[PDB]
Amino acid sequence: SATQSKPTPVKPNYALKFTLAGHTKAVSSVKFSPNGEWLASSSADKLIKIWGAYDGKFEKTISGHKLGISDVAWSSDSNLLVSASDDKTLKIWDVSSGKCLKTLKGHSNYVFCCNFNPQSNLIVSGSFDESVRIWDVKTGKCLKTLPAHSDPVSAVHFNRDGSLIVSSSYDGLCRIWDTASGQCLKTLIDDDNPPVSFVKFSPNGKYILAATLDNTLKLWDYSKGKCLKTYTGHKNEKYCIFANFSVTGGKWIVSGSEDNLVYIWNLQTKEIVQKLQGHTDVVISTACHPTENIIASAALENDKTIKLWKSDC
């Protein structure tokens, strides 16, 4: 009919815009600055790199860790980074100068994961040493050591007001902790216990998104301790692969995958809505831009690049 019209899209159309080369070993994490201007990457090459979020332009390299870095995270004001390294330390960095402000010492094995609280006065870390540590940003001192897990801690994240921390571990548990006291408020262990390789709070703090090493992501209502959504079809049995809530356009879940693709699901229906092809190794990390429909993806040693993808919705 002459009245036929183009239907409103129900899937995104992410397309490759830039490939970011410079790391010399596997990329381990990518994160967008809260102000939207920058992308930070960490690598097994012991370096952090900063790139422009919209143009993919290399900006600077930040260096000082003695061994590879598994995770990097921004402060709320986009002025600081914290990194987690195999050298058993975290470092706090002034992004503008590239200088190390503090070295956070206390973990007894690799530090795998890190995050600032919303206020950005605290940092949370998780380690192969099975502990979660809470650090004061201004002093660099460890405030609390939580005997959180019985195997390596794969992820740590604060909720939206900082009052809670969620941790995950290869022990098969996710635990929720009261930040102020360090007490465990809940353990999620519904059914059997495959290693949990990633967890984060949803942006409203009412759910947790958790990855397990059986090719499965789950959205849990942890206040009810019930699984609301399951996302499958990707490959994840080996690596601690980040996942994201994409909120700028359509409401998606985004993850890397061991088949070298970026997977995007419809959060509500659980349908795979896009698979982004181009990387030549496992996609270990993805990040979603805070205001624009932009995904960054990063891959392991056969690839060593970060890709920026943009969608109309």
UniProtKB/Swiss-Prot annotation:
GO terms for cellular component: ATAC complex; histone acetyltransferase complex; histone methyltransferase complex; mitotic spindle; MLL1 complex; MLL1/2 complex; MLL3/4 complex; NSL complex
GO biological process per UniProt: gluconeogenesis; negative regulation of transcription by RNA polymerase II; positive regulation of DNA-templated transcription; positive regulation of gluconeogenesis; regulation of cell cycle; regulation of cell division; regulation of DNA-templated transcription; regulation of embryonic development
Keywords, ordered alphabetically: Acetylation, Chromatin regulator, Host-virus interaction, Isopeptide bond, Nucleus, Repeat, Transcription, Transcription regulation, Ubl conjugation, WD repeat
GO terms assigned for molecular function: histone binding; histone H3K4 methyltransferase activity; histone H3K4me1 reader activity; histone H3Q5ser reader activity
Effect of residue 301 to A: Strongly reduced affinity for histone H3. No effect on interaction with KMT2A
Main location per the UniProt record: nucleus
UniProt cross-references to PROSITE patterns, sorted A to Z: WD_REPEATS_1, WD_REPEATS_2, WD_REPEATS_REGION
Phenotype for residue 300 to A: Abolishes histone H3 binding
WD repeats: 22-61, 64-105, 107-147, 148-187, 191-232, 235-275, 278-312
InterPro entries xref list: G-protein_beta_WD-40_rep, WD40/YVTN_repeat-like_dom_sf, WD40_repeat_CS, WD40_repeat_dom_sf, WD40_rpt
Cross-link Glycyl lysine isopeptide (Lys-Gly) (interchain with G-Cter in SUMO2), sequence positions: 6, 25
Impact reported for residue 242 to W: Strongly reduced affinity for histone H3
Annotated site (Important for interaction with histone H3): 86, 112, 242, 301
Protein location: Nucleus
CDD domains for the chain: WD40
N6-acetyllysine: residues carrying this PTM: 91
Reported impact of residue 70 to F: Strongly reduced affinity for histone H3
Effect of residue 219 to K: Loss of interaction with RBBP5 and reduced ability to stimulate KMT2A methyltransferase activity in association with RBBP5 and ASH2L
Self-association and partners: Interacts with PAXBP1; the interaction is direct and links a WDR5-containing histone methyltransferase complex to PAX7 and PAX3. Interacts with HCFC1. Component of the ATAC complex, a complex with histone acetyltransferase activity on histones H3 and H4. Component of the SET1 complex, at least composed of the catalytic subunit (SETD1A or SETD1B), WDR5, WDR82, RBBP5, ASH2L/ASH2, CXXC1/CFP1, HCFC1 and DPY30. Core component of several methyltransferase-containing complexes including MLL1/MLL, MLL2/3 (also named ASCOM complex) and MLL4/WBP7. (Microbial infection) Interacts with herpes virus 8/HHV-8 protein LANA1; this interaction regulates the MLL1 histone methyltransferase activity on viral DNA.
PANTHER family: WD REPEAT-CONTAINING PROTEIN 5, WD40 REPEAT PROTEIN
Function of the molecule: Contributes to histone modification. May position the N-terminus of histone H3 for efficient trimethylation at 'Lys-4'. As part of the MLL1/MLL complex it is involved in methylation and dimethylation at 'Lys-4' of histone H3. H3 'Lys-4' methylation represents a specific tag for epigenetic transcriptional activation. As part of the NSL complex it may be involved in acetylation of nucleosomal histone H4 on several lysine residues. May regulate osteoblasts differentiation.
Similarity remark: Belongs to the WD repeat WDR5/wds family.
UniProt protein name: WD repeat-containing protein 5
Gene that produces this protein: WDR5
